[model samples]
Target: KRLEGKVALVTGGTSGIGLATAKDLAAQGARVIITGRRQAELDQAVAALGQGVRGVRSDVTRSADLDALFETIRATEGRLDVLFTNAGGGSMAALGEISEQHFDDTFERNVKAVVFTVQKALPLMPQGASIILNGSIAGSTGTQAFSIYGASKAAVRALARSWVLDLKERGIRVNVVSPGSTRTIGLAELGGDTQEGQDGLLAYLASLVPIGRLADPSEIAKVVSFLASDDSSFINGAEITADGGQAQV
Candidate 1:
């Protein structure tokens, strides 16, 4: 119960890392509000979280939805203790083949949404609030078919650095949690529908990591819990890469 009585908001919590973090946070006694684009999925996630969590239907790219999301939190909870800006996805876009829509959509979801998500929450994010941004190993590496996605993540990395300074005055800490090749629905979406297709790529990625295995979503969640708790009080503007040596070596 390290997070006893804390309040947290997790964007893109319908599945994958976001969902895992929501559950982990709730387990630590945080009242979590998760958001997704699908109302049905949102409801299901809310039910899955039992009484410790709620779900809001929100598309991060939509400014209005973000506005309403924060307002709902403000109206219901009044303030927030942690904010996990984890709502982002990417598509494989080969350099020459990348379209304007691809670049726009990727940046909108990854960069712009993150910027405003924290900004809009400033009012409710009281002093000493913890803000965590989700990043990727792709941001620091030269991975093929991930140029656009990687660039967007680079923006996220920068945001963590800048926000640390911007919010330092209020004692709000900002950090980045960068994961390497992990087995999540988001990866499957990137690889397409066929198992062979997805697994083939996943295997190739796994081979690059010294661990020879993908990260479990729960692994990332635990790290998030640490960052959102007083355990990491002295840590600020740091990027914790949970990549199992994939990006480092």
Candidate 2:
């Protein structure tokens, strides 16, 4: 019960790392609110998360949706103890193929949305609150055709470095959890529609990790849960990479 009596909000909480973290937080006794772009998935996730959890249909790219989300949280919970900005993704595109729209979309989802997610929630976050930003080892390492995605994640890493100073007066802590290769629906889709292609992709990703395997979503969740809890009280503005030493070596 490390997070007992806490109120947490996880954007992109319908699946993958977000869903796992939300469940972990709830299991540790936090009142959790999860958001997704699709209503059906949101409903399913809420049900799967069981009691003490709520779902909100929100598109992080849309400001109105975010505003409504916080409004509801303010009205119901009045304050937020943990905020996980886990709503971001980008497709691979090499430099020559990267379009203006692609860059804009990537930054809009990964950068702009993150900035406001915390800014708006600041009013509702009291002292000792924790803010966790979902990042990727891609930010620190170079992967062919993944430059834009990596750059966006790099920006996310930079945010925590600076935000800690900005929010220090409020006693709020900002940190980044940069996971390496993890098996998730979004990752699967990146491999295309064929089972063989997916397997190849996963195998390739696994080979990049020194641990010789992909990380389970639950593995990432535990790290996030630690960052969200008081056990990490003295930690702030740090990037904790849960990549099985993929980028370390």
Candidate 3:
């Protein structure tokens, strides 16, 4: 009940980390609104979250969709207290194999969408509101064929640092939650959509982690819940890495 009266929004809430975080927020008593590109998934998420949650079918890369999302929020909740701009994605591509389309697609979802998601939510956010940006350990570490994704996430970290100054006077806290190797559908699919591929991928990822295991999505959700609550009142412009020491060591 740490967020008993808060109104929260999570983009990409239909699955993976986003879905888990949305559930965590609601459990803590926040009225959560989740957004996804597909109506079917959005419906499923809302139903799974049960009460204290709603869903909006939206593609963050689309301005019109974003506008509609915020408009509905403004009308229904009138204000937002916790904003988790968690909608972003990227695929691996070595420098030589990277194309303009790949680069643009990565940045469009990771950087541009994040920028506007925060900008648009600012008006509805009041003093003391918390804004959490989803980042990655990849941003700070080098991984083969993941340069573009890493670079995009690096930009995410930079945005949080700069935005703290920009919104300091308004008392809005901004921070980044960077997860290391997490087990999710996206991660499973990264191995080529086959059971064997996924198992091999998970094994390789686990070998990289000092903890001897990949993180569960719930682990990331807990950290996010803390950031969205008053418990992290003084934390701002900080990147909290939840990588089980994978990035630290």
Segments of candidate 2 deviating more than 4 angstroms: none
Where does candidate 3 have its weakest 10-residue lDDT segment? Answer: 51-60
Candidate 1 wrongly placed segments (more than 4 Å): none
> Which should have the higher lDDT, number 1 or number 2?
2
Report the lDDT tens digits of candidate 3 across residue range 138-222. 9999999999999999999999998999998889999999999999999989988789999999999899999888999989999
Computed on alpha carbons, the lDDT of every model, listed in order, comes to 0.89, 0.93, 0.93
Instruction: Rank all candidate structures by their lDDT, best first, as comma-separated numbers.
Output: 3, 2, 1
Judged by lDDT against the true structure, how good is candidate 3?
0.93
Q: Write the per-residue lDDT of candidate 2 for residues 1-249, one digit (tens) a residue.
A: 999999999999999999999999999999999998799999999999997799999888888999999999999999999999999977899879999989999999999999999999999999999999988999999999999999999999999999999998999999999998999988988888998888888999898889999999989999999999999999999999999998898
Q: For candidate 3, report its TM-score.
A: 0.98
Evaluated at residue 71, the lDDT of candidate 3 is 99
TM-score of 1: 0.97
lDDT tens digits, residue span 84-118, model 1? 99999788878799999999999999999998898
